[PDB]
Amino acid sequence: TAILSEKPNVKWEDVAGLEGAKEALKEAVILPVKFPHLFKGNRKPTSGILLYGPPGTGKSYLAKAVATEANSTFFSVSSSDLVSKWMGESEKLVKQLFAMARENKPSIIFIDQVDALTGTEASRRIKTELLVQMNGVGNDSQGVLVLGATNIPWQLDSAIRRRFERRIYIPLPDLAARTTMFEINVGDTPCVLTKEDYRTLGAMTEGYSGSDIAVVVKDALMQPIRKIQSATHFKDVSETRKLTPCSPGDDGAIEMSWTDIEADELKEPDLTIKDFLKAIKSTRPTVNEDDLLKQEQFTRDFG
């Protein structure tokens, strides 16, 4: 299981925002696949694409969407794992990976953290084997497309860099995308959030990543459970008896614990925007603001 394989089922719409990358990938990858007769002779589809941008944008998830939409098998590998965990057998692994992908066209190879192939003799082999394999466009043949992912494109070996004809920036999510991420992350959970609240949550998380948003949302959803747990005082409201947590000393405030209260006849506190706003304060964004420039320096130079 050093090499993952799957026929993923991620539609474009399942990936929050990124419409620009998406549209780049559509014409870079999907057009060739949709209309292969366009690529007779010396006109050949891209076969290396680098995805670069700050962490927490789900470059992986987007990659699966491409596979789903190209109707191809998704083969994938982590370069950090290759360099550290497997080491000795890494040459063999990079081989087998390209070999599986050839045997399974149409297919996509995903190499995560391509920077981690180069430096801190032994992994010099991995670099070298990868390069030979990406010359496997000039095997015959393909078929197979390599999508590299990096957070630190400026630390990516220029030789490897050069094998990735096409480069696409995966930005931090904008207002609309963050709004979508909040919705997706709560999905079906019982709550009383409006369309406007989602937008508010969106607007209020400038500079957050999908990951960041995921952690904030995971935090917020637990709040009603959190309230039920640490009360101390409940109260009847309203189909026969129904009690919810309330402050010490209130209109009908009995003193008890959740344990004291009967099956069902609990009234969980509503899940409010206020729970999410709280969660936003206690989870700072992950990604430094100087990254914009560092990534944009790369878009300017090797875009």
DSSP characters for 226-274? HHHHH-EEEEE------EEE--SS-TTEEEEEGGGS-SS-B-PPP--HH
Is 58 one of the annotated binding-site residues? yes
Is 153 one of the annotated binding-site residues? no
Is 60 one of the annotated binding-site residues? yes
C-alpha torsion sign, points 239, 245, 251, 256: positive
SS3 (DSSP) at 146? strand
Q: Which of 98, 167, 110 is nearest to 138 (CA)?
A: 98
Q: Where are the alpha helices (DSSP H) in the chain?
A: 19-25, 31-34, 59-70, 79-81, 90-103, 124-134, 158-163, 175-186, 195-203, 210-220, 223-230, 273-282, 291-302
Range of the domain at 295: 1-172+286-303
Q: Residue type at 135?
A: N
Is 150 one of the annotated binding-site residues? no
Contacts of 138-143 with C-beta under 8 Å, sequence gap 24+, read 139/102, 141/102, 142/47, 142/102, 142/105, 143/101, 143/102, 143/105, 143/106, 143/107
Residues 92 and 223 in one domain: no
Locate 55 and state its tokens: 């962490």
Q: What is the CATH number of the domain that holds 42?
A: 3.40.50.300
Residues 143 and 1 in one domain: yes
DSSP 155: G
Is 202 one of the annotated binding-site residues? no
Residues 222 and 185 in one domain: yes
Instruction: Give, to the nearest 10 degrees, the angle between helix 195-203 and helix 273-282.
Output: 10
Is 53 one of the annotated binding-site residues? yes
Is 143 one of the annotated binding-site residues? no
- β-bridge partners, 77: 111
Is 54 one of the annotated binding-site residues? yes
C-alpha torsion sign, points 177, 179, 182, 185: negative
SS3 (DSSP) at 111? strand
Residues 151 and 128 in one domain: yes
- Compute the half-sphere exposure of residue 278: CA atoms within 13 Å on the CB side of its CA: 13
From CA 156, how far away is CA 172, in angstroms rounded?
20
Q: Is the previous residue joined to 119 through a cis bond, with omega within 30 degrees of 0? A: no
From CA 299, how far away is CA 53, in angstroms rounded?
10
- Phi/psi at 266 (5° precision): -95, 135
Instruction: Give the largest CA-CA distance in the chain.
Output: 82
Residues 167 and 179 in one domain: no
Give residues with Cβ within 8 angstroms of 23, minimum separation 6.
Answer: none
From CA 32, how far away is CA 207, in angstroms rounded?
35
The structural domain count of the chain equals 2
SS3 (DSSP) at 76? strand
From CA 263, how far away is CA 249, in angstroms rounded?
24
